[PDB]
Amino acid sequence: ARYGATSTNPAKSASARGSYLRVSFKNTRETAQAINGWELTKAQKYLEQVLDHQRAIPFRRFNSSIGRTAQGKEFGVTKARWPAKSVKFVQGLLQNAAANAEAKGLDATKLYVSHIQVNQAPKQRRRTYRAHGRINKYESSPSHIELVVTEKEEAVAKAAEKKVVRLTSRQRGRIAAQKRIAA
Amino acid sequence: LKDVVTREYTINLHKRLHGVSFKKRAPRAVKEIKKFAKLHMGTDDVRLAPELNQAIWKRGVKGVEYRLRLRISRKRNEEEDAKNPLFSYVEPVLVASAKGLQTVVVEED
Amino acid sequence: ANLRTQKRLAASVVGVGKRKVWLDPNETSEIAQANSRNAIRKLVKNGTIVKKAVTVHSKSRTR
Amino acid sequence: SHRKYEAPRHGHLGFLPRKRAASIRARVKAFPKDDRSKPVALTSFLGYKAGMTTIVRDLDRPGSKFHKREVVEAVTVVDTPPVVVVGVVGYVETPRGLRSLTTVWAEHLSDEVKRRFYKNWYKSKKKAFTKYSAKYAQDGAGIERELARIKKYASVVRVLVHTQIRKTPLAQKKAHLAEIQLNGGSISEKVDWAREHFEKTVAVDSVFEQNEMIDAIAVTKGHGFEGVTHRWGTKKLPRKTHRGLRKVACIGAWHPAHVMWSVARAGQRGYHSRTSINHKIYRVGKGDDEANGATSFDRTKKTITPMGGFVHYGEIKNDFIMVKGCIPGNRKRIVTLRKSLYTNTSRKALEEVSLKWIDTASKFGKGRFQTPAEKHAFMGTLKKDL
RNA sequence: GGCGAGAGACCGAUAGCGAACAAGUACAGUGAUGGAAAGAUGAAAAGAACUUUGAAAAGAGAGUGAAAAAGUACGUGAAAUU
RNA sequence: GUGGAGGCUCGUAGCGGUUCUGACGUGCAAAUCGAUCGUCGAAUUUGGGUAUAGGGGCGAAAGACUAAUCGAACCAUCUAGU
RNA sequence: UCUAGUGCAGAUCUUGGUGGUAGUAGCAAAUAUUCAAAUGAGAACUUUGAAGACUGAAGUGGGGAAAGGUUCCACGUCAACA
RNA sequence: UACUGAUAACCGCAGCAGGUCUCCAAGGUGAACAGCCUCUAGUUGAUAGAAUAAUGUAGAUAAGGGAAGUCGGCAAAAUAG
Ligand SMILES: [Mg+2]
Ligand SMILES: [Mg+2]
Ligand SMILES: [Mg+2]
Ligand SMILES: [Mg+2]
Ligand SMILES: [Mg+2]
Ligand SMILES: [Mg+2]
Ligand SMILES: [Mg+2]
Ligand SMILES: [Mg+2]
Ligand SMILES: [Mg+2]
Ligand SMILES: [Mg+2]
Ligand SMILES: [Mg+2]
Ligand SMILES: [Mg+2]
Ligand SMILES: [Mg+2]
Ligand SMILES: [Mg+2]
Ligand SMILES: [Mg+2]
Ligand SMILES: [Mg+2]
Ligand SMILES: [Mg+2]
Ligand SMILES: [Mg+2]
Ligand SMILES: [Mg+2]
Ligand SMILES: [Mg+2]
Ligand SMILES: [Mg+2]
Ligand SMILES: [Mg+2]
Ligand SMILES: [Mg+2]
Ligand SMILES: [Mg+2]
Ligand SMILES: [Mg+2]
Ligand SMILES: [Mg+2]
Ligand SMILES: [Mg+2]
Ligand SMILES: [Mg+2]
Ligand SMILES: [Mg+2]
Ligand SMILES: [Mg+2]
Ligand SMILES: [Mg+2]
Numbered sequence A: 001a002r003y004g005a006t007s008t009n010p011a012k013s014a015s016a017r018g019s020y021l022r023v024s025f026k027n028t029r030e031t032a033q034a035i036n037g038w039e040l041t042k043a044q045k046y047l048e049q050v051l052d053h054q055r056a057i058p059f060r061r062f063n064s065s066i067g068r069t070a071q072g073k074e075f076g077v078t079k080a081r082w083p084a085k086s087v088k089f090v091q092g093l094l095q096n097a098a099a100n101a102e103a104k105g106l107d108a109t110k111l112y113v114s115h116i117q118v119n120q121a122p123k124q125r126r127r128t129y130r131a132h133g134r135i136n137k138y139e140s141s142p143s144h145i146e147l148v149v150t151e152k153e154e155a156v157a158k159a160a161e162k163k164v165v166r167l168t169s170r171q172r173g174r175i176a177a178q179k180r181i182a183a
Numbered sequence B: 001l002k003d004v005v006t007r008e009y010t011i012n013l014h015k016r017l018h019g020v021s022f023k024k025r026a027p028r029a030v031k032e033i034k035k036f037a038k039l040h041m042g043t044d045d046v047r048l049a050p051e052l053n054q055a056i057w058k059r060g061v062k063g064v065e066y067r068l069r070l071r072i073s074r075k076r077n078e079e080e081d082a083k084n085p086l087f088s089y090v091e092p093v094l095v096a097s098a099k100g101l102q103t104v105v106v107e108e109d
Numbered sequence C: 001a002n003l004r005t006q007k008r009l010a011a012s013v014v015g016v017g018k019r020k021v022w023l024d025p026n027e028t029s030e031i032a033q034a035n036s037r038n039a040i041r042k043l044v045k046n047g048t049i050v051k052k053a054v055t056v057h058s059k060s061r062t063r
Numbered sequence D: 001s002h003r004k005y006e007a008p009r010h011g012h013l014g015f016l017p018r019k020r021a022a023s024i025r026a027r028v029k030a031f032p033k034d035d036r037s038k039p040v041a042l043t044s045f046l047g048y049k050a051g052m053t054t055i056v057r058d059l060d061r062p063g064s065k066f067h068k069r070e071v072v073e074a075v076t077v078v079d080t081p082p083v084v085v086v087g088v089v090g091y092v093e094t095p096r097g098l099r100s101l102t103t104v105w106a107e108h109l110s111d112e113v114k115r116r117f118y119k120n121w122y123k124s125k126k127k128a129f130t131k132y133s134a135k136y137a138q139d140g141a142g143i144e145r146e147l148a149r150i151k152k153y154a155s156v157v158r159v160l161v162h163t164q165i166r167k168t169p170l171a172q173k174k175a176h177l178a179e180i181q182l183n184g185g186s187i188s189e190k191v192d193w194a195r196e197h198f199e200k201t202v203a204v205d206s207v208f209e210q211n212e213m214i215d216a217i218a219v220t221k222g223h224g225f226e227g228v229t230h231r232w233g234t235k236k237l238p239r240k241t242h243r244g245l246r247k248v249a250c251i252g253a254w255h256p257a258h259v260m261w262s263v264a265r266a267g268q269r270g271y272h273s274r275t276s277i278n279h280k281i282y283r284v285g286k287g288d289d290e291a292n293g294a295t296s297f298d299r300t301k302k303t304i305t306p307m308g309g310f311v312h313y314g315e316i317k318n319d320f321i322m323v324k325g326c327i328p329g330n331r332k333r334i335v336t337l338r339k340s341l342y343t344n345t346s347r348k349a350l351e352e353v354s355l356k357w358i359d360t361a362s363k364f365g366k367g368r369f370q371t372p373a374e375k376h377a378f379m380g381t382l383k384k385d386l
Numbered sequence E: 001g002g003c004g005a006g007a008g009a010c011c012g013a014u015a016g017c018g019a020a021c022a023a024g025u026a027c028a029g030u031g032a033u034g035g036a037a038a039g040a041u042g043a044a045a046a047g048a049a050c051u052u053u054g055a056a057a058a059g060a061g062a063g064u065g066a067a068a069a070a071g072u073a074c075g076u077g078a079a080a081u082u
Numbered sequence F: 001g002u003g004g005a006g007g008c009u010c011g012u013a014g015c016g017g018u019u020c021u022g023a024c025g026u027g028c029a030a031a032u033c034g035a036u037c038g039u040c041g042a043a044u045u046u047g048g049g050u051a052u053a054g055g056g057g058c059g060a061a062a063g064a065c066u067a068a069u070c071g072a073a074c075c076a077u078c079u080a081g082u
Numbered sequence G: 001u002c003u004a005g006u007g008c009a010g011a012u013c014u015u016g017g018u019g020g021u022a023g024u025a026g027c028a029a030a031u032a033u034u035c036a037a038a039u040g041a042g043a044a045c046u047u048u049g050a051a052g053a054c055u056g057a058a059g060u061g062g063g064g065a066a067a068g069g070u071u072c073c074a075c076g077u078c079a080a081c082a
Numbered sequence H: 001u002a003c004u005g006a007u008a009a010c011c012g013c014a015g016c017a018g019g020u021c022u023c024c025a026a027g028g029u030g031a032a033c034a035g036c037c038u039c040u041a042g043u044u045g046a047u048a049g050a051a052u053a054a055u056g057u058a059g060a061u062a063a064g065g066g067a068a069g070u071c072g073g074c075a076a077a078a079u080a081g
């Protein structure tokens, strides 16, 4: 409950969330942004292809000193990877949201990922043993994922504000003179 | 799609394992046989007979035969159908030498 | 399934090591119900567990 | 302080940046100066390097100790199937360089050359020059006025030619296409020569002749990322060097507080475009001919090809150029042969070369024999024979 | 100091005794000794029956409550950081 | 010829720790790994028990060792020492 | 009006928390794993079978002393640890 | 009075290549509980897959010369029963 910021109709929307999931925050963020705004079946097909290494997930932000591949050309980048675990969590949540939409009674074919956000969860901390008798941290950086799918509506509306206009007497007289000499 | 066929092939492993690490020869022979079957039959589901595994490992890791005669049988799948409805079963063929032989279809007898 | 303790009991019963004990793979349900040395003995009698053939070390070239 | 002992720079700085060439076909960055008196001819040619072999010849060098004596020399063979002329384009001079104004093409382009305009030919409507070819069939309208434009302008003229790759043993199927300058006279005659040779073939015998000096322009063999030692020829540090000896020890002084461009650094070795000059032609051989490997002294009917074929290339069923020595590139690589730019008399570029013998023994091993008949005579009947 | 009482222009959970809590506790050290952290759902558990997706955790609904922008990671819920 | 002495000798187990000034050097390790080496029947190695306690011990002697602490240990107090 | 434990940017300040570094260094000693089936939501790692290998009796075997203290055995079982 | 007795049950902050007392001890080669192979017994554990650039660590080979290298024959080779 109390999802992130949305601009959508909750009646034409369905939601899913997964908290305290032991999966890399940095990889899940990229995996989510790879399907933000996407049609749902297209996204599911894409993620299956990512698992089968036929397509890739573009890494935009958490990408330092990672490798390159040809499967980034699809997105205008060179740095792309195939985060299996994040993909599987994300498509589980997509399954959940699609089932919730079917229960709400939605079209099931006009659905698109209108919202998907990943934020950090509390660290799960273990120890690393280093040289010279030292102890460092070894933390998992888990993820909360929330996503909202929405039905696509046609063009929204028109008929903007009244657009009141204030004229000086000089401008009114100019308009009157032009309307007099012309038609 | 169609074609539940069975065939007998000869695989040259000497050229496929050329230059390979000795403790990875036979393991790579397994994978190259799977790739051979996926090439010839179009099946990513490739099940090997343990008799073929024994034939591969009969001389240890770094003693794999230069040539191996295989019976690859494409079959219709079962098992609560997976992504692919076909799988290739690779068995060995008992023959004196696998040299001189060319590919032959096998009859459903 | 899990037949570690069955193989252990069978070794102790047959008087050999686990490297000899042979459990048939087609009677796993019959072997997993075996929780006792007496049942292991029954299964050794009926052929579900057999000791093994000892591995030979011939002294022929030596001779 | 000053270097204890003097030594020269390791490497040549005018061959930088030692980077990969932009293409696999090296481009001619200079053509011979034009004399507008001689007939119209190509200044260059396209071929594929097959391999190297061994030559014997009687040397004519008066003053040497080997005058009128037999020497053994290494040659490289370039398979030169006839090129096909498809197109010309005129270049006019400007204060910013030579600029092309028009490119006229032939009516019928072959598949092997229109494969050069596709990256995926197996899935295409092939739709290439399908409107330019309909630009013909009205007598000469959109073509003759372009040619007249090239005549009215275009101080420089170049013909577009492509290779007949299907005549080679290579499995590439995609022809190499290149601009080659014409160095006759009368740009009108240049372009008329081109128009007459459209869709038609030009052989290497019409371009090169024996005892002629030429330049070979090719991309050289690639060797990937290489360390400073083999890339630049620097000294190996001694054995008891921590953290590696196959390095440069000092890569600069404290000031300038930077690594200088002139310091040897690891990187790409090979696949640079190189121009190698003054390689004498020792034979221009035809493919409508057996005894290509025969001479006035051998007189045994044998082709230029060794027993078993040129390693990694194949046969020389087409024409060929046997040129002295070693040229850049490896086997199967496209080579651009170019006429010399200066007149080299030199008492060595004028030596008339008369071959005595050509090695046609196998290059796949220590070849004992030059011909299967020789093999059969030496060895006798075998269990295979009857 | 012990037992029993009454007070304060004292401190208010990084304060005040080390200790507002199963504190001289857990834990460390051969040992003498050393020595923490840690309070607050709500008036009341009324602590989420039931449906559905999912292997399950959970989710989406529904429902309780004045309020789940109070769900035993629970008053308010800052900043860094995301 | 016999015999089989030795703080003899080659060389294992073992005890030690030369050289590579090798590996490692945010290590497997707050001293290790590998190879090369000294020695290997005795002034040998080693378990357990026992004695010696801080201006004191113990020292085939390096100011070495005395629980990762030694040209005077560790703990608390004097002590919020100056 | 009285009163003071009254105002923080620093003190290699104290305690707690959080970043960039960075999905980076790295998870490479000890010869070596492979095939099938079963189980299961899910198997490079669980079990069985088959094969290939090692320790090679101054053993990766079978037992013990010190030390540990239930780690033994079974059943169930995977949120954390491995 | 179970059990481990150690590349996971002890001590080293830990499931650390370290340390930690002892008994039994097969066949062959061979002087030999040396090294190498094997039987009994026990393991098959150590994150994996794909490639094979540089630089490394460990192992090696090199024509002709033969210490000219370096503070120094360091290292390696040669010798070897
Ligand atoms: Mg960078
Ligand atoms: Mg890196
Ligand atoms: Mg560590
Ligand atoms: Mg430690
Ligand atoms: Mg190789
Ligand atoms: Mg000078
Ligand atoms: Mg100097
Ligand atoms: Mg060179
Ligand atoms: Mg050094
Ligand atoms: Mg050769
Ligand atoms: Mg409220
Ligand atoms: Mg509240
Ligand atoms: Mg709260
Ligand atoms: Mg903030
Ligand atoms: Mg020793
Ligand atoms: Mg050492
Ligand atoms: Mg060192
Ligand atoms: Mg290092
Ligand atoms: Mg004693
Ligand atoms: Mg002194
Ligand atoms: Mg000490
Ligand atoms: Mg003070
Ligand atoms: Mg104050
Ligand atoms: Mg502050
Ligand atoms: Mg200040
Ligand atoms: Mg600070
Ligand atoms: Mg990495
Ligand atoms: Mg490492
Ligand atoms: Mg147990
Ligand atoms: Mg007892
Ligand atoms: Mg007992």
Ligand SMILES: [Mg+2]
Binding pocket: H003
């Ligand atoms: Mg015991």
Ligand SMILES: [Mg+2]
Binding pocket: H005
């Ligand atoms: Mg023991």
Ligand SMILES: [Mg+2]
Binding pocket: H005
């Ligand atoms: Mg033991």
Ligand SMILES: [Mg+2]
Binding pocket: none
């Ligand atoms: Mg311990």
Ligand SMILES: [Mg+2]
Binding pocket: none
């Ligand atoms: Mg301790």
Ligand SMILES: [Mg+2]
Binding pocket: H030
């Ligand atoms: Mg003997």
Ligand SMILES: [Mg+2]
Binding pocket: none
């Ligand atoms: Mg003994």
Ligand SMILES: [Mg+2]
Binding pocket: none
């Ligand atoms: Mg021995």
Ligand SMILES: [Mg+2]
Binding pocket: H046
């Ligand atoms: Mg490891």
Ligand SMILES: [Mg+2]
Binding pocket: none
């Ligand atoms: Mg010198």
